[PDB]
RNA sequence: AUUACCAAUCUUUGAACGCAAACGGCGCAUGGGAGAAGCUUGUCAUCCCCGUGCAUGCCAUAUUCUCAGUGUCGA
RNA sequence: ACUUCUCGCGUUGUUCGGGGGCUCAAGAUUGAAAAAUGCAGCUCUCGUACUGUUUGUUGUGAGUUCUAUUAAAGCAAAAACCUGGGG
RNA sequence: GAUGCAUCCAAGUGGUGUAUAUCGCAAACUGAUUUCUGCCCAGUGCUCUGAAUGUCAACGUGACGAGAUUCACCGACGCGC
RNA sequence: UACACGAGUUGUUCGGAAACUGAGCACAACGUUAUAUCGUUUUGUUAGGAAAGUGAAGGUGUGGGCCAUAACUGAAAAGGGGCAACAGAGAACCUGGGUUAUAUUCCAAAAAGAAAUUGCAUGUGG
RNA sequence: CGGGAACCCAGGUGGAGGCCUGUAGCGAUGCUGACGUGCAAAUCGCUCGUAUGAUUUGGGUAUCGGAGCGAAAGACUCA
């Protein structure tokens, strides 16, 4: 709630950044296979627990 | 089947003496040079109550013979011993009620508690509350005293063992009836974890040799052999005389 | 003036009285004592006993006198000795480099053993103690097999200082120069009077069984009760 | 006979030669620069990071995470020749350590954001 | 400049080895480098960084680097 | 001291009974903090000013108070810290 | 009665009751007071005892065969009683 | 509380650690094990040699000692370390107020103030 | 304490108790209530048991698979 180690804090911060959409300069690339991010977590759906 | 409660107890996991509110092990002062070739005086300062014992433990301080400190000794308290009694525990010690003069030097027919079997083990025998030994015979040619343990079984010990003079405190504990399961709860919560005792005949025939049946009966004779394996050695172990006398 | 402290029993804190005898010594310290007492207790066989009846200090220093002056060359007079075997040979015309050890005592172990088997060791000196005691146990017994005068002497560390090593199991003193046939010819006599003349009683001599001063003065205080 | 006044044998205090101070376990060069440019990495421009330059005299730099409030002050003075009194820090929910920096009330903060180009 | 290949840089860890550990924590040496109050324009006070070293076991070894032993002996 | 007495709501204290003192921890008090704060109304027109800057009673409560009662239950330990004896 | 008893562990100067010491520990049974708790030790169990009671274990002893082996015997604690 | 973008968590003193011990854990050693990742292990370890905290002579600027830092020794001193409590112990801060969202955390010089407190320092008191 | 040569008649005081009513807490008797494609892979309602205690509860900590733990139902050991 208020106690999280800094290491456990560094690992949720690395997840708050991974939870951004694919930028719309990626899907005009020549031959990419990416249309969606397909690794977006939602805090309710699935939990990280770390 | 499964292991039986008695067998499942020398693992000592949960069924292990508690001893957190206990004081140290209560025992005589270490048998050094001073308690062999003289005495040393010691003042009784505090008589506490180790949780889980009916006998009072008296905190006796002596002086450390070699360093300059005051070493502090925890001893079981003979009845009558009060705070500030100046206890003597040596060779030439007097024989007042509480002193620890050696066992072969105490007069015969006397009354001694907290006697010790081996010369130095710091007090083993006659050490629960109200318990004591009577000195019967000295054998100065052998150098061994025959004292009568507080069970009738009278043995012979060496005449150089040490022994307090008196009766252990808290005598008459076992005569006040408990009157309720709750006063047995608080007795064993300072002692180890064996309460309540479920009867093995009220158990299932996987957890105990007696359990089973449509009726609560011991199927085979309760008296089990001395040689019987553990997990079977349940009931009346090597019972040589059986039942009401 | 005075202050008097009685460090009697229970009456005052003593000074730093030396204990050094009731203290807990480190393992090897006690264990090397319990070792030299255990082999005094037991019934030492008449073959191992031989090494606890060494020469006396009377002629032992004399025996170490010979071994010392006939000690080998110390890696410096060895390398400059065989150097004059080239310096005065490279200037020599040819076919003349002949050199050897000047004169010394056979100080190894397998070199000594051959000095005995060859019966060329005039007499051999043997050390009181070597760790695998069996390594020299048989030495004083192939001597009276080949009739060499042998000498069990008090310390291998004193057969090293004479020679030059740290320790030496056995020194053999073979042929010597006439500067010193007097001092050893008696040494042979002073020593076989202790080892060869005694050959019969030596091989029938069970040692040990030496009780304590604590547990055998007790056996004195009871014949006092007789 | 050595005097032992103890029940135990404690190890004798023998000689204790010091280590040799091995040369180094590296070759890689260092400077005065990298020690002060790794800490203060870039300032911050937000509605709150701007409101604190003008109103207060603070600045906002996203300092590196394993820095130190005493070394953000040194770094300021080494980079922006201004004094720093209070350096409040916080490791944001991005793993990035922000830093608020009072400028001693003698170096106007609004004269550094205009110098530093914030 | 890109690509390809073949001397470096190589964070925090991990055998992980200064100690610890849900601590991005704590030391002991050892340099050097900031920062400053005093103080003599600079000089090292705690404070604070950077780097090395510091785990246990084992082997070797030390110009005669120190020691222990009622082990052995001798002066 | 002829049994007196001091007790508390209460299971008790003396073998101490009054007059002054020495402290002790609660706790009040004046004073600083401290009114330029703050709540706020205002006369007027974030400016602008000033006029009021109030304590008493009850009751319940949390701690203080008194290291009774269940005890074959007697109701943790340690650092740091503190004082003293020797110094 | 501690070189104990109950018991754990693969084993160990290991562990549990036991910081305990027969007013204790372990193990059963019955189930508060009150009231009594009868008879049966053949059995199967525990238990001692073992002089002699009857018999056995390798080991040890002997003789046999050249030797593998045979034939014994010590009947020993135990096990019967 | 969805999606997107942007922001947002401020400490000498609050909590934690640095720095206590509890139930307990078990690195080392030691033992055992074909084998260990097993067991013992603070009511104090280990067949068991388990450590700079101090005091010192000597070294050093300089008119051979006034005075001073320092080295490197080494004074007694038994009982190896080490974890384990965000409710036990311990713990130096309190109001007032000017964020879209933080505040016993922020406020700058008529610190909005007022304290306590640790470290090192200069100096008035003996 | 009152009041009368034994120790009874009463008056208070005090506040004990695995005592009683009862809130929370913890349980789950009855309705064999309602749900039974649930709200719910065991819940809901009312009733009800207990509620200073052999109590409830938090965190830590011990003991687990031919085993643990059990006031013993072969209960419980992540449905
Ligand atoms: Mg069965
Ligand atoms: Mg059966
Ligand atoms: Mg040894
Ligand atoms: Mg070098
Ligand atoms: Mg490690
Ligand atoms: Mg080498
Ligand atoms: Mg030396
Ligand atoms: Mg010696
Ligand atoms: Mg204390
Ligand atoms: Mg969203
Ligand atoms: Mg291990
Ligand atoms: Mg209810
Ligand atoms: Mg928690």
Instruction: Give backbone dihedrals phi and psi of C203, rounded to 5 degrees, phi first.
Output: -70, -10
Decide: helix, strand or coil at residue C48: coil
To which residue do tokens 């070394």 refer? Answer: D71
> Does strand E come within 7 Å of the CB of D81?
no
- Max CA distance (Å), chain B: 72
CB distance B40–C9 less than 8 Å? yes
Residues 6+ apart with CB under 8 A from B70: B61, B62, B63, B64
**Burial of residue B196, with CB atoms counted within 10 A of its CB: 0-12 exposed, 13-18 middle, 19 or more buried:** exposed
Number of cross-chain residue pairs from A and D with Cβ atoms under 8 Å apart: 15
Does C10 contact B at CB distance below 8 Å? yes
Task: Please state, in angstroms and as integers, the Cα–Cα distance from residue D108 to each residue in D5, D55, D56, following that order.
Answer: 73, 11, 10
Is residue B58 a contact partner of residue B109, using CB atoms and an 8 Å limit? no
Chain B partners within 8 Å of C13 (Cβ): 65-68
HSE at residue C98, side-chain half, CA atoms within 13 A, is: 2
∠ at Cα C93 (C87, C96), nearest 5°?
A: 70
CB distance A16–D91 less than 8 Å? no
Is residue D80 a contact partner of residue D98, using CB atoms and an 8 Å limit? no
What is the C-alpha to C-alpha distance for residues B148 and B158, in angstroms, rounded to an integer?
13
Question: Residue B147 is inside which H or E element, if any?
Answer: strand B144-148
State both tokens at C191: 């020593």
**Burial of residue C107, with CB atoms counted within 10 A of its CB: 0-12 exposed, 13-18 middle, 19 or more buried:** buried
Is residue B78 a contact partner of residue B114, using CB atoms and an 8 Å limit? yes
What is the C-alpha to C-alpha distance for residues B100 and B95, in angstroms, rounded to an integer?
8
> Does strand G come within 7 Å of the CB of B190?
no
> Does strand E come within 7 Å of the CB of D27?
yes
What is the C-alpha to C-alpha distance for residues D50 and C56, in angstroms, rounded to an integer?
103
Q: Between the CA of B186 and the C1' of G20, what is the distance in angstroms? A: 18
**Start-to-end C-alpha separation, chain B:** 36
What is the C-alpha to C-alpha distance for residues C81 and C76, in angstroms, rounded to an integer?
8
CB distance D9–C19 less than 8 Å? no
Q: Give the residue from chain A lying closest to D65, CA to CA.
A: A10
CB distance B40–C14 less than 8 Å? no
Which of C5, C6, C10, C15 is best to mutate for the B interface (most B CBs within 10 A)? C10
What is the C-alpha to C-alpha distance for residues B104 and B146, in angstroms, rounded to an integer?
9
> Does strand G come within 7 Å of the CB of B129?
yes
CB distance B37–C13 less than 8 Å? no
Task: Tell me how many helices (H) and strands (E) chain B has.
Answer: 1, 11
Is residue B44 a contact partner of residue B58, using CB atoms and an 8 Å limit? yes
* DSSP label of C51: G
Does C23 contact B at CB distance below 8 Å? no
Does A9 contact D at CB distance below 8 Å? yes
Is residue C103 a contact partner of residue C177, using CB atoms and an 8 Å limit? yes
What is the C-alpha to C-alpha distance for residues D95 and D65, in angstroms, rounded to an integer?
7
Is residue D49 a contact partner of residue D74, using CB atoms and an 8 Å limit? no
Distance from the CA of C29 to the center of ligand 3, in angstroms? Answer: 8
Nearest to B40 among C10, C13, C14 (CB): C10
Q: How was this structure determined?
A: cryo-EM
Residue count (chain A):
50
Q: Between the CA of C86 and the C1' of H77, what is the distance in angstroms? A: 67
Chain C partners within 8 Å of D3 (Cβ): 16, 18, 20
**Burial of residue B164, with CB atoms counted within 10 A of its CB: 0-12 exposed, 13-18 middle, 19 or more buried:** buried
D25 known member of a binding site: yes
Is residue B105 a contact partner of residue B78, using CB atoms and an 8 Å limit? no
Is residue C59 a contact partner of residue C190, using CB atoms and an 8 Å limit? yes
Does D92 contact A at CB distance below 8 Å? yes
Does B42 contact C at CB distance below 8 Å? no
Nearest to C9 among B37, B67, B68 (CB): B37
Task: Please state, in angstroms and as integers, the Cα–Cα distance from residue D117 to each residue in A45, B158, C21, C86, D47, following that order.
Answer: 44, 97, 84, 90, 16
What is the C-alpha to C-alpha distance for residues B114 and B60, in angstroms, rounded to an integer?
15
Instruction: Give backbone dihedrals phi and psi of B83, rounded to 5 degrees, phi first.
Output: -80, 115
Nearest ligand to residue B234 Cα: 2
Of the candidates C125, C148, C145, C137, the residue with the CA atom closest to the CA atom of residue C61: C125
What is the C-alpha to C-alpha distance for residues C111 and C106, in angstroms, rounded to an integer?
7
Strands (E), chain B: 41-48, 57-61, 72-76, 87-88, 111-113, 133-139, 144-148, 154-158, 164-165, 223-224, 236-237
State both tokens at B193: 């974890």
Sign of the C-alpha dihedral computed for residues C75, C78, C84 and C89 taken in this order: negative
State both tokens at C124: 């051999």
User: Ligand 2 being an ion, which residues bring their Cβ within 5 A of it?
Assistant: B 209, 220
What is the C-alpha to C-alpha distance for residues C204 and C178, in angstroms, rounded to an integer?
38
- 18-77 of chain D touching strand H, CB 7 A cut-off: 18, 44, 46-49, 52, 55-58, 60, 69
Q: Between the CA of C162 and the C1' of G60, what is the distance in angstroms? A: 59
Q: Where are the alpha helices (DSSP H) in chain B?
A: 181-188
Distance from the CA of B180 to the center of ligand 12, in angstroms? Answer: 26
What torsion do the CA atoms of C165, C170, C174, C178 make, to the nearest 10 degrees?
60
Of the candidates B27, B163, B156, the residue with the CA atom closest to the CA atom of residue B91: B163
What is the C-alpha to C-alpha distance for residues D56 and D73, in angstroms, rounded to an integer?
17
Which of A5, A8, A12, A13 is best to mutate for the D interface (most D CBs within 10 A)? A13
Residues 6+ apart with CB under 8 A from B161: B102, B103, B104, B115, B116, B117, B118, B119, B145
Chain D partners within 8 Å of C26 (Cβ): 9
HSE at residue A6, side-chain half, CA atoms within 13 A, is: 8
What is the C-alpha to C-alpha distance for residues D41 and C145, in angstroms, rounded to an integer?
95
Of the candidates B48, B21, B5, B57, the residue with the CA atom closest to the CA atom of residue B189: B21
Strands (E), B164-234: 164-165, 223-224
Of the candidates B209, B212, B213, the residue with the CA atom closest to the CA atom of residue B231: B209
Is residue A18 a contact partner of residue A12, using CB atoms and an 8 Å limit? no
Instruction: Give backbone dihedrals phi and psi of C172, rounded to 5 degrees, phi first.
Output: -115, 130
**Start-to-end C-alpha separation, chain C:** 53
Question: Residue D98 is inside which H or E element, if any?
Answer: strand D97-102
**Burial of residue B8, with CB atoms counted within 10 A of its CB: 0-12 exposed, 13-18 middle, 19 or more buried:** middle
Q: How far, in whole angstroms, is CA C155 from its chain's centroid? A: 3
Residues 6+ apart with CB under 8 A from D55: none
Strands C150-153 and C121-127: parallel
* DSSP label of D31: -
* DSSP label of C72: P
What is the C-alpha to C-alpha distance for residues C94 and C183, in angstroms, rounded to an integer?
40
Nearest ligand to residue D2 Cα: 8
Question: Residue C31 is inside which H or E element, if any?
Answer: helix C27-41
Is residue B129 a contact partner of residue B169, using CB atoms and an 8 Å limit? yes
∠ at Cα B146 (B143, B149), nearest 5°?
A: 145
- 59-88 of chain B touching strand G, CB 7 A cut-off: 76
Of the candidates C149, C144, C159, the residue with the CA atom closest to the CA atom of residue C193: C149
Does A7 contact D at CB distance below 8 Å? no
- Chains in contact with chain C (at least 3 beta-carbon pairs closer than 8 A): B, D
What torsion do the CA atoms of C205, C208, C209, C214 make, to the nearest 10 degrees?
150
What is the C-alpha to C-alpha distance for residues B114 and C2, in angstroms, rounded to an integer?
45
State both tokens at C165: 């090593």
Work out the number of other CB atoms within 10 angstroms of the CB of residue D9. 14
Does D66 contact A at CB distance below 8 Å? no
Residue count (chain B):
245
């Amino acid at each position: 709630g208020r106690f999280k180690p800094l290491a456990v804090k560094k690992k949720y911060a690395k997840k708050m950044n991974q939870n951004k959409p694919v930028p719309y300069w990626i899907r005009l690339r020549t031959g990419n296979r990416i249309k969606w991010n397909e690794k977006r977590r939602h805090w309710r759906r699935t939990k990280l627990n770390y | 089947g499964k292991t039986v409660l008695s067998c499942r107890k020398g693992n000592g996991s949960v069924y292990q003496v508690h001893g957190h509110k206990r004081l140290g092990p209560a025992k005589l002062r270490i048998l050094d040079y001073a308690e062999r070739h003289g005495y040393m005086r010691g003042v009784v300062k505090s008589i506490e109550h180790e949780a889980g014992r009916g006998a009072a433990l008296a905190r006796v301080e002596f002086r450390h013979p070699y360093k300059f400190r005051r070493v502090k000794e925890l001893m079981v308290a003979p009845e009558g011993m009060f705070t500030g009694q100046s206890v003597f525990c040596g060779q030439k010690a007097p024989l007042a009620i509480g002193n620890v003069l050696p066992l072969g030097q105490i007069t015969e027919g006397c009354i001694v508690c907290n006697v010790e079997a081996k010369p130095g083990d710091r007090g083993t025998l006659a050490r629960a509350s109200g318990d004591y030994c009577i000195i019967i015979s000295h054998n100065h040619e052998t150098g061994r005293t025959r004292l009568k343990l507080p069970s009738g079984q009278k043995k012979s010990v060496p005449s150089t063992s040490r022994a307090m003079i008196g009766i252990i405190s808290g005598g008459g504990r076992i005569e006040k009836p408990v009157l309720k399961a709750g006063n047995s709860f608080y007795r064993f919560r300072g002692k180890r974890n064996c309460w309540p005792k479920v009867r093995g005949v009220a158990r299932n025939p996987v957890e105990h040799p007696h359990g089973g049946g449509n009726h609560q009966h011991i199927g085979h004779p309760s008296t089990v052999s001395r040689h019987s394996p553990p997990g079977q050695k349940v009931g009346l172990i090597a019972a040589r005389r059986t039942g009401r006398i | 003036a005075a202050r008097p402290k009685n460090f009697g029993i229970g009456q005052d804190v003593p000074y730093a009285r030396d204990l050094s005898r009731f203290m807990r010594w480190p393992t090897f310290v006690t264990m090397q004592r319990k070792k030299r007492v255990l082999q005094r207790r037991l019934k030492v066989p008449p073959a191992l006993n031989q090494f606890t009846k060494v020469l006396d200090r009377a002629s032992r220093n004399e025996a170490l006198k010979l071994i010392k002056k006939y000690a080998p060359e110390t890696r410096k007079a060895r390398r400059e000795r065989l150097h004059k075997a080239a310096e005065e040979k490279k200037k020599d015309p040819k076919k003349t480099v002949s050199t050897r050890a000047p004169l010394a005592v056979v100080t190894g172990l397998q070199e000594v053993t051959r000095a005995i088997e060859k019966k060329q060791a005039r007499m051999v000196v043997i050390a009181n103690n070597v760790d695998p005691v069996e390594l020299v146990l048989w030495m004083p017994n192939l001597c009276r097999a080949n009739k060499i005068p042998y000498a069990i002497v008090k310390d291998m560390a004193r057969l090293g200082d004479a020679i030059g090593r740290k320790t030496a199991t056995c020194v053999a003193i073979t042929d010597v120069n006439a500067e010193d046939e007097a001092t050893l010819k008696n040494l042979i006599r002073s020593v076989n009077a202790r080892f060869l003349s005694r050959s019969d009683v030596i091989r029938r001599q069970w040692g040990g069984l030496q009780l304590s001063l604590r547990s055998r003065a007790e056996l004195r205080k009871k014949h006092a009760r007789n | 006979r050595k005097s032992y006044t103890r029940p135990q044998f404690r190890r004798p205090h023998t000689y204790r030669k010091p280590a040799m101070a091995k040369p180094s376990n590296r070759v890689t060069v260092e400077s005065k620069d990298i020690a002060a440019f790794s800490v203060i990495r870039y300032p911050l421009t937000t509605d709150k990071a701007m409101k604190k330059i003008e109103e207060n005299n603070t600045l906002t730099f996203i300092v590196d995470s394993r820095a130190n409030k005493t070394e953000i002050k040194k770094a300021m003075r080494k980079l922006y020749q201004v004094k720093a009194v209070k350096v409040n820090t916080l490791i944001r929910p991005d793993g990035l350590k922000k830093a608020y920096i009072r400028l001693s009330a003698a170096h106007d903060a609004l004269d550094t954001a205009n110098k530093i180009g914030l």
